[PDB]
């Protein structure tokens, strides 16, 4: 990368933002017309969640819309990251659109707007619709067309006052934990040719929706990777090659959780070199045809990165050290991730990065005081921008920044143990207290980041 | 029951079979156009079947047709219950008809018609075409149809010469086994409701391949269920009562694997009462019009029976005895089921029974002689055959027996490790030996069962 | 508020923070063997060095004065002063604890002895360990040479540290060495043979100096929904219930034997294969007169008359660890052990597992843990208030430390350790802790 | 053919076939507290009464005498003879045995005692069993009551049967009694004063009558591809190795000591935290001259030319409890110990399970078990043939019994046992193997 040099800092128009999804919010998930959604089934199983938790109410901000841009107004942010649920919109996934569905989407978008602030929305955040899901979801050769026709749903009810879209939200797990490990709805454990044949629907399905999305208004599109960035050992330039080495990697046995392996398809237009071996029972055939609509030209590449795994020089991965310093759901805290992700994946694909998800999930509690206290997430924020920074200052390009999440929320088969907003929410009253870390974030912001 | 007596014995039109399923015997799993089924994908998963053994090959049948029919003639075997791989003739599951598939059929018909030999086929024995599996299988609300395009196929095809059809083998087990244990293809655990959805989706495919099924030429039409009778304490009368209560019973927690969650909708067109209390997340919509299209008049009730349990005077289930007669797949030997099971099907629905499987898995050997010595299927045989003998003279309408299995063959997740045959099969060259036992049923069949 | 002579504490474990495990002729302890066995603790941490307090005895001692605390209390590796868990002592071993006990007299800080928190000796685990008919003596053996080499200047010890868990988890779950899964008549066995074990131990302790003796249970308390008489009665009987299917966790099944010297109703009823046979001079031996019931108290559950134990609360504030923060349960499991049994209670631990690291700022800033001491605390002065004799209060931990099976990856300590130097920083928990034993709780 | 002099015999073990677990003074073993703990056995099956064969002795030696058998080999309860493992000799339990012999000497059959089949006092369980550094000594105070009140009439003796199952599943996989998963520094201990325990039992055999003394392993013989010599060789190296991730259940980890004094190379460099010290006088101990080695044999492997191990054939001949049928294991592992060790071979036991039951004729048919035995005796006459020094063949088992976890649901008798009556039927296998032994083998 050619380097910027450390002065000028973050750029002036750096979208400062905050994050969350559908169903970790929402609530009303048997409301208003709303179609099931795969989580309201699995989360409904028992022993799926943690204590068997659900997202049927989870922040209530299906209710609750005008008092969370309120909080998003006092802290001043810049931009606003949520889903759509698909469900809400189109109860059978194609087809009817439910039109009080559309009107939440289009009070909240107005909202954001009265408010100044940049609407960034996210397409697909897990929620499949049942129906969908009844007729094979990602496994049925159809289900790019279904994303397409939501996509197409999607730019024309939202293509006049949303400018800034998100196709997919983390392949790695949906996939790799929905139908891979199986703690992620619907909770399947397929094999290797049916995890590729759904990777291959999910891209196709991306260039579709990409395609929809740029009929009409002008826009910017990513697409969202779960990232856990290498950090080599060393300033080494060998060391270095070995951690950019190890990030892009992929195999057979280990693909569905990396980088390469659904990047290098959306921007390179390429699968692995691995991929074209693969003789499974059941494989998909992936045509020269399929990596051109994969490959529609896109604005930015999302990283979501919580932390990284440190590499020796050879690129194996270190054991953690003793007593590292880790996050209420187990994570370590590894702050030069959110310097070697960003710096590798810009020297891959030489795309903008958006950061679309950053944050700790800590074990916060209403003090004495009333207060949410949470300097862990402080220190957390401060140290990973610190690193984003020096990201920028080496070249990176890098347009915005979001706090994963405004509001503590449901967190998949954690259930409600893990809170990583910067509003604490009881939830048993629904009360909303912004947290030292939202004050802190505010301050990040109307300084654009000068004083870290 | 109002009794027949005994002077008859077997009546003089009884169907004395033999039976197999295309999975377990044809090979030939990707030859000839045939599209994959459940079972290709499956059995090739790691961990999936006993050794990673699978059907890829099985006893090669596909090539050794005109060896096996032989073997049917040279035992004098009336009938020969045999299924049709659907992804053979539908390599897509509907659309364009696979004429290699039809035309393997139609030579196996042909040669049971010239050795007089009665065909008796199942379209259903659990391989799915893997291309409707990919659109949901048994959750699309479209499965019905898929299943009465294939019901149509075989009725145009098969119509003139095959008048003996089952549309199912033993939902029990494929909806069961498949879906909520998931040690049978597909591999899954679902939830209550969805196992309800496959159910009711399985029930209106049978209706509709009914509905096609009597379109032309005559015929016979059964379903076969999996049942493990219950075994009264004595002849008492309310020890028969209690017994019968129990084989008849199902609840929400425990229905799969009964006998009446699945033959009171065939036969009297209704559920069991509980069925209309369930109010779990995404239940299927149960409708008059369902059970009407489920309840079309069919000829025979198919059991397949290999053992019973004993209960108590109260229904409740009594512990197997120390060291009881077992099988090599580890079953109990439990002469008394194919007594009690045919009778209690015939006192509640009053219809014609045929036993459409019932044998024993033995670890079969060739000796030193060069023969295959199977005394233990042998008394398995004679002591269950008088049991239905008895249920004949007490007024069971039993119209069939069918021996399973023709052939060792592919015992789904044991593999190979499980024979069931009267005939042995080499598989590392494919020989043909008929046991002990093949010769006994020769003898039984010959004697009409008079001197058992 | 509290009174005068209150016992305001820090507590640690030999395993959990001394490391020197294989030197100066110490023995082999059932953590040391277990601890480096594939898969049984996080990372395959071990206590091999832990916090290396054995050869940083006086930087912590001198973190004890700094803190103003007037009670320390350790337990001693019974490896380490008998290697072969009887027979000959290791004076090295010994020279070590009396160098601790010096230190603490030198600072006026009263010393509160534990002779067994979980590290049995591993020669005595080869011989069968509390499955042994002799392991009551084998225990008397130590205690009596804890008496003799530490009588003069330790006059507070207690025999046991939760049984609920070195039994539970180490013979029954087999999470905690030495990691065994055994048959309810083998678990009652162990149970009756600690028992008879604490018995022998309190004789040997009454041999020479008075002392106070005490017996500490993991409790989690059960805290009536309400102040309603009804709610009440339904949490205590709730708290003091136990069954052959869910016993050895419970607080009855051991505090009924030590202090009223009977098992619950339902150990008469076991005719197991292999059960022991209970005598009367058995229940007699474990009925020695104590000073006071040690409770270590985390947390515990939400009791009503009509809910019986409700569920947790969606989003209940918790720990680093996964517990929850139920501030209540330092008033009720006080109160009701104190209504139950009659004796002085001592809370020998509590405290809170944090994700705690060096800020930015290079302090260690654990603001969730000084509010989890500060609503304990004020449970606890409402019990004293309320007419509970409590003597004493010790936080859990004095240093961060070798959690179990959770290996590092668990912090108890008010002061961080970084284990790559070995460096103590006193967290703000500490000068919160400072602060309230000056004061001596007059402001909480 | 067969030696004129060749041992026909047939097997059983005390806890699968006795019964009367816990009358005439007789102790608990560790199976009595195994077999009684939820889940660890087939339907909870147990050997409280088993075959009743403590009251039914008569019967059986009249079965024994019926079928001609030269040998009866049978193991002694420990608990039985000693009920707390050492002190107290119980006469009763030596009475029962004492019949036993007698009635054996009456019908001119040559008594075989196994002194350890698996059913280890509970009392020295308790103790810490294997564990214990004196184990050993446990085993020599047995050993010298053996030789003391059976050394007159018994010139047949066998210390341990199987150390690969009893260790292997006892300790490491646990699903033998006493049902550990232990680190493999405890495996290595347990081996050790197993082994140590055989070296003492043999000194004490030695002591008064003249007789031959064997040791029992549980083998499964690696079968050459072929017979070229580089295929042989590959076999043979197979079958003599082990490593630390796999020797529980190998051949030269037992035997290698026992007739070569020396572990595998591999076994001394182990430094695991708490491993045996093995000496120099400790391998002199073992190695005590014996007279034959014993072999149980059930089946073996099929190695390719590299002496790695093939796949089972698909649909390979196989039994009741799940095991394949190759008959060239009882040529190959006879052929390969003989060059390996140059002592003589006991097949101690050889059988098959099998589904069998009463056929409606009021018979027991086996013609599997007779192909079995047919089968594997050609095999092993063939090895005689080809100079392999075989002095016996033992076929396991007289009476189907309590097949361990499997409980009852495992018949591997000559004589089937319907346990409702106790009524013993002779299978056709019986009067086979009767054929055999009148023929002496000579035209199988």
Same mark, same amino acid.
């Given at each position: 990368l050619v380097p910027r040099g450390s002065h000028m800092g973050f750029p002036k128009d750096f979208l400062w933002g905050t994050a969350t999804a559908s169903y970790q919010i929402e609530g009303a998930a048997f409301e208003d017309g709303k179609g099931l959604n795969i989580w309201d089934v699995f989360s409904h199983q028992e022993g799926k969640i943690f204590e068997n938790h659900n997202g049927d109410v989870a922040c209530d901000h299906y209710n609750r819309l005008?008092?969370?841009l309120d909080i998003? !107004? #006092?802290?001043?942010?810049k931009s606003y990251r949520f889903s759509v649920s698909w469900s809400r919109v189109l109860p059978a996934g194609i087809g009817q659109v439910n039109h009080k569905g559309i009107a939440f989407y289009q009070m909240l978008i107005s909202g954001l707007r009265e408010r100044g602030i940049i609407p960034c929305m996210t397409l697909y955040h897990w929620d499949l619709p049942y129906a969908l899901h009844? #007729?094979?979801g990602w496994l049925n050769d159809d289900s790019p067309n279904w994303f397409a026709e939501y996509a197409k749903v999607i730019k024309t009810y939202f293509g006049k006052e949303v400018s800034y879209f998100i196709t997919f939200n983390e392949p790695q797990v949906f996939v790799g934990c929905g139908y891979l490990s199986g703690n992620h709805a619907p909770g399947y454990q397929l094999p290797k040719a049916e995890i590729v044949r759904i990777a291959h629907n999910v891209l196709k399905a991306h260039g579709l929706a990409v395609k929809e999305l740029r009929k009409g208004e002008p826009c910017k599109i990513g697409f969202t990777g779960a990232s856990c960035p290498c950090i080599p050992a060393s300033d080494r330039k060998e060391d270095i090659? $070995? $951690?950019?080495?190890?990030?892009? !990697?992929?195999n057979s046995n280990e693909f569905v959780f990396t980088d390469a392996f659904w990047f290098d398809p959306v921007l390179k237009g390429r699968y692995p070199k691995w991929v074209t071996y693969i003789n499974n029972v059941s494989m998909p055939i992936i045509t020269k045809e399929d990596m051109e609509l994969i490959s529609q030209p896109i604005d930015f590449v999302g990283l979501n990165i919580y932390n990284g795994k440190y590499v020796n020089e050879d690129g194996g991965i270190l054991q953690k050290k003793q007593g590292?310093?880790?996050? $209420?759901?187990?994570?370590?805290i590894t702050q030069e991730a959110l310097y070697w992700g960003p710096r590798f994946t810009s020297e891959r694909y030489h795309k903008p990065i958006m950061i679309t998800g950053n944050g700790m999930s800590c074990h916060d509690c209403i003090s004495l005081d009333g207060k949410v206290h949470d300097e862990n997430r402080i220190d957390y924020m401060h140290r990973y921008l610190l690193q984003l920074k020096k990201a920028i200052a080496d070249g990176v390009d890098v347009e915005g920044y979001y706090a994963w999440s405004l509001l503590d929320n449901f967190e998949w088969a954690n259930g409600y143990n893990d809170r990583f907003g910067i509003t604490y929410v009881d939830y048993e009253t629904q009360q909303r207290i912004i947290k030292d870390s939202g004050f802190f974030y505010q301050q990040i912001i109307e300084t654009n980041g000068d004083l870290l």
């Open positions: 005008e008092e969370d998003l !107004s #006092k802290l001043g942010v009844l #007729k094979g090659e $070995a $951690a950019y080495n190890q990030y892009f !990697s992929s590292v310093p880790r996050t $209420a759901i187990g994570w370590p």
